[PDB]
């Protein structure tokens, strides 16, 4: 396209001379002549870049651009361009920093508005007031996202590059997130209402650990070579190959905006897929900030797509769309059942569910009390109640029942309530207004049946959406609070007789759910026995809320199926081809 | 005549399966002990291999020479294979982040799910039963098999051999009948935790739908396909003709991985088809018990 | 590849470059090369897009019938 | 070779007619015409066998015979032979049975005498008298064994058959051993002096479990397909294949004649190797009986080879021989070092060692005493002392030291001593005379230094080689008995202060060896902490002597390297090829 000057032709002829030397036979280097089709090794690509850099002083050339421009005309044209030849933020000053939050959609590595410039407000639960407006996605926008994702997979650069190359980009993404860790943590505190000290450790911290972990797996996903029956006297050879499925449609909950995004997205990209994320409506801002960092990290455009909006509009369309092959979900049972039904009707697509549960926590007499009280509170009141593996029920032994509850009340009084940005704060405000309303009805319905309210169980006189840490005692199995999940800072305590292991297990296991469980004991025989009998995904022993990115995580009966985190996570996003030879 | 199952009978089967899992001997014994019983089952099937092969020829209409190799043969190989796995299903010990200065230890355990409800197609009565049942029992589960209505007799003969092999009572349960009556109930039943299926797409979609509504149970599908077969000029023709016919006409057409389409190159197109017609004329048609027979009668009317 | 299904496929060729190239591009579960109808109990078996999901036969067949508990200690 | 009659030609022409029908094109069937080269499938082999069985009434034909005789003349000749066409034992009547023991060498599936008909006597330690004479191997005999093994591997049937076929033969071997389990157990009682009730459970029992376990692995040894860097724009494919090494030369100890043979041989044959076993001179009879059963099981001739004789003559030659590629060994450090030295000088062959150790056993106060006494004795006095993972030292806490020792002495008095065939017997006679002599010197040297002899420590007044169960107390770390291994029924007890975990670990770990260890405690924190700090291969918690064929087994520092049993065992006997393509 671009016309050459007198000096540029002298450079072009010097490049033409190099091509003759580098390539083996090469009768004549015309414009049509391709570099690799002639017969160029991977060593020859390095020799080319170095030889061109000797001619032109500077010229920041790399091996990647050689693979792009294979032909001679394409190479020279590209080389001439090197020689001769904005994101709308919302500013806000808090926590000795100046935040810059994107508020638009993200389709094909570009921040763009929705159809008709439709928007919705996002709330700050600390004060109660609005922070900014965010773009509301439509059905037309979903079509563009899935189209962009499919192009990035098939024809795009993401598919072409090596497994080791994909891993480097995912590791570089984590380093960018590490630099903006204080910035992301502050946005969580405004958006979700999470405490700042906790947000660095849990919300932002694990997110960084997730992308670093699954980056390592990229070039360690091996198939097999099977010793099958040889058709004597002829020979046979069978082997397996793990491949990507294609496009994926993730839908995340509101309890952990950034962390739940990371858990699913990191594993999906590691396998080698393109993604269309759908964040929660209450908390979209963390996801849009993450989309900004993918450009800096240097992810190809189209790979990551984000559409903030309503679940019934956007989420339902992804299920119905035939191009999408995989639906990740973490939320409630009723909503989860609807996705699996839509998955079957659409195009028999794959699905993995992660539903809520009513996790028990047995506490025997032989265990030390001071640690049991600490970890007892840390099960219930971790992340202002909102935790998917929160202690639903606490079974305490008769001998240490009265002593246990007395110590809990003392510590609950000491707990600080205030602004989450302040370092002195322990307990923070609830995520959104609609959630707070149900927690009031929960505690009201608890007292009706006849559960002894020790402390709390009502809203705090304060501007915002704060709630008092609550404790219930003398709770039977038949009650509503025993069965139904609170999903808030409410401790539910129960009694069981001395020296009765089999009976308490029957009460604990008597539930349709089974996500997590716990037990505190010094005796080794109890610990190992109880761990076997407890029908749950994740059992804890003398601890609680101790997950790892390496360790797998998932439910049993009515807490979904499949696994997040660990090696098992990758198996969901991969598919196995089986090649067979005969010779 | 064969007994037609009802809704009342399904309840008894699932009840018997649950008792065998929880309170029964199947759960209590070791993994190595379960593997021995599954290996002993295969040796019993090997003794009655000529008997099972003859029943296939009457019931399904399969050729006798093929039935020994494929239908009955692979069934024996299946139970021998998955018997070995029983005491080789290992978890892991994960190097997680230690809460310094305190220590931590994480480990995984692979366990059975519980009761399973298998539904098999009619193309391979005994083989498709073996593929799913063997793997299910190897993990350490109790099963409620539902055979095809057209071909129930192979499954009922298999149930006789479990008593001889010495499988605890309640583990294996078989209910010959209609798919809409029996198959639909297994999906709806809350005690069942897993539904194996191999058949058509329309029918397969209905099970996954019912699985979601019931009790978010697990499911694995194996549906039909239209498999291509490309044939280039550079390949040797005589072998290509043999394996070309052997893709299509294997097991009298009825094969889930049958060659749907054959793409042949222009240079050897006319030559290929000419050789196929010659060999198709030579193919014998008759009674499947006769050894001379190559092609047999279709499964049902 | 223009089909909603994808359970199995095949190819006959002497040239090694074609065999390995075609095997990659064919969107199917089980690819055969200079053979057909050659399954094994050890080798896995299953579909891709609209031929179901999961696997029968092999080590992968056990995973669907098993469930993973995760025990965690502190000391 | 064989001439045809008038009726045989009518059969031959009927077979000729079948070949025309079965094979696709086949212009004319002549004597030279091969079955498979024409283009015969695996289905066609079944059609042939059935069609021939229709003609001839009876005729027990199988598919294996068709693979042997591929040509038409070879098939017809073989078929005509089917239509038309001793082991020297030593009888002995004991235990309501009539034993039949081979006493010769075993080279190429044939019992044969040695060069010059040289022999040596084998002793019965119960009585003291001789039972029979056994053939003494020479250097000439070793050459024949290795030659037979190499032919069986390369040109023999063992290599040609499938992995699944090898597994069936190994499983059939176990079923034959199960039928002759009472017979093998009785030979152990005469040869080794092992108790009959123990021999069924341990010696013969685990041997059967070993061959059943490794039979399953045969067709489950998978390689990999590695996602390597693609030389863009060209493609690449890498895969691994696990293969056999070749010939192996196993040398077993005398403590467990049949069990140690099974552990190594089963894993070696499972990988797909040929073996040359060398049993201990004191106990050869169990190995020679095992060789008889391989013929019944139907193992190809040349696979298993056995050469009873001296270690310095036979064992040294196997190391020097260049055809041998692998040396398995279990014994002492002195002898073990010599093999690894000879392995390097010969032809840099592979080696895995399993040497003796001085295993500690810590006993805290919090543990229950009655169980600790049972498992305390069961560590030391299991299999009449002779156990490679025997408790070398017992560290007991001060609070329960006096109480523990008092209970041990009471139970040691109750222990029965007599003939091993008698069911009432608990403790049996020592393996051989030379072993008994060292155990007397051991206890004599113990009293010299100043160790309080509680009971025992001398020979029993009885015909045979019996020895009294011994107990030592007040033993320091500097003493000889503390450091050196007894390898006999001698309990060594020591003291350590209350509430001192770090100190007792320093004393326990202070040793060059590290094969096994143990700890008894109710407290879970101690159990998990002590298990980490104990420098040993196999740690037991509230148990002892609990090995499994699935669980791996091997030493650390100066107890050899590599593993026996489990999946890790196979890796030693296999080698990894790495094929790489470009397209
Ligand atoms: O637990 P849950 O909270 O009720 O829902 C979890 C997530 O799923 C979305 N959702 C709700 N209904 C849905 C549907 N029918 N299909 C797909 N996604 C849905 C929600 O989006 P919204 O929070 O935007 O409804 C939310 O982000
Ligand atoms: O050949 P197909 O049609 O692919 O069906 C395969 C198998 O599924 C059964 N089936 C048919 N409809 C069903 C339903 N709605 N739910 C569960 N199973 C069903 C059939 O039983 P039947 O052959 O007994 O209908 C058959 O054995
Ligand atoms: O009890 P040990 O002494 O630990 O020896 C263990 C085994 O190795 C043999 N052995 C002894 N010296 C050897 C050498 N130099 N090379 C190879 N093997 C040897 C012994 O055979 P012998 O018991 O026949 O010496 C014995 O069966
Ligand atoms: S929906 C699942 C929610 N996730 C969690 O509960 C996991 C959060 N826990 C952690 O990140 C760490 O275990 C904490 C408690 C923050 C710190 O542990 P520390 O021992 O390193
Ligand atoms: S629904 C899947 C149906 N199964 C099959 O098509 C597999 C049947 N094939 C075989 O049993 C062998 O592959 C045969 C055809 C007998 C060839 O074996 P030979 O080469 O030892
Ligand atoms: S040189 C290695 C020595 N091996 C052993 O000590 C292993 C022998 N132990 C066993 O066979 C079982 O562990 C016994 C002692 C019989 C207990 O089994 P039980 O608890 O089923």
Residue numbers in the entry:
A (entry chain D), D (entry chain A): 313 to 397, 405 to 902
B (entry chain C): 452 to 752
C (entry chain C): 828 to 902
The publication says:
Putative tumor suppressor ALDH1L1, the product of natural fusion of three unrelated genes, regulates folate metabolism by catalyzing NADP+-dependent conversion of 10-formyltetrahydrofolate to tetrahydrofolate and CO2. The protein exists as a homotetramer, with each 902 amino acid-long protomer organized in three distinct functional domains. Overall, in the ALDH1L1 catalysis, the 4′-PP arm of the Int domain transfers the formyl group cleaved from 10-fTHF in the folate-binding Nt domain to the Ct domain, where it is oxidized to carbon dioxide. Remarkably, the tetrameric state of ALDH1L1 is indispensable for catalysis because the intermediate domain transfers formyl between the catalytic domains of different protomers.
To elucidate the potential effect of NADP+ on the structural organization of ALDH1L1, we also prepared cryo-EM grids after adding 1 mM NADP+ to the full-length protein. Single-particle analysis of the new dataset containing 202,398 particles produced a 2.9-Å resolution map. The arrangement of the Ct core and Int domains in this structure was identical to that in the ligand-free protein and corresponded well to the configuration of the Ct and Int modules revealed by NS-EM. We found that the cryo-EM structures of ligand-free and NADP+-bound ALDH1L1 were highly similar (r.m.s.d. = 0.86 Å). A small difference was observed in the NADP+-binding site, where the C-terminal end of the helix formed by residues 652–666 was better ordered in the presence of the coenzyme. Only the AMP portion of bound NADP+ was clearly visible in the cryo-EM map, while there was no density for the rest of the cofactor. To determine the fraction of free (not occupying substrate entrance tunnels) Int domains, we performed local 3D classification within a mask encompassing each Int domain and calculated the total number of particles that contributed to empty versus occupied classes. This analysis produced estimated average occupancies of 76% and 83% for the Int domain in the ligand-free and NADP+-bound structures, respectively. Instead, the Int domain of chain A was docked at the substrate entrance tunnel of the Ct domain of chain C, whereas the Int domain of chain C was paired to the Ct domain of chain A. Therefore, each Int domain of ALDH1L1 is paired to a Ct domain of the opposite dimer. The 4′-PP group covalently linked to serine 354 of the Int domain was found in the fully extended conformation, penetrating deep into the substrate entrance tunnel of the Ct domain and making multiple contacts with residues forming the tunnel.
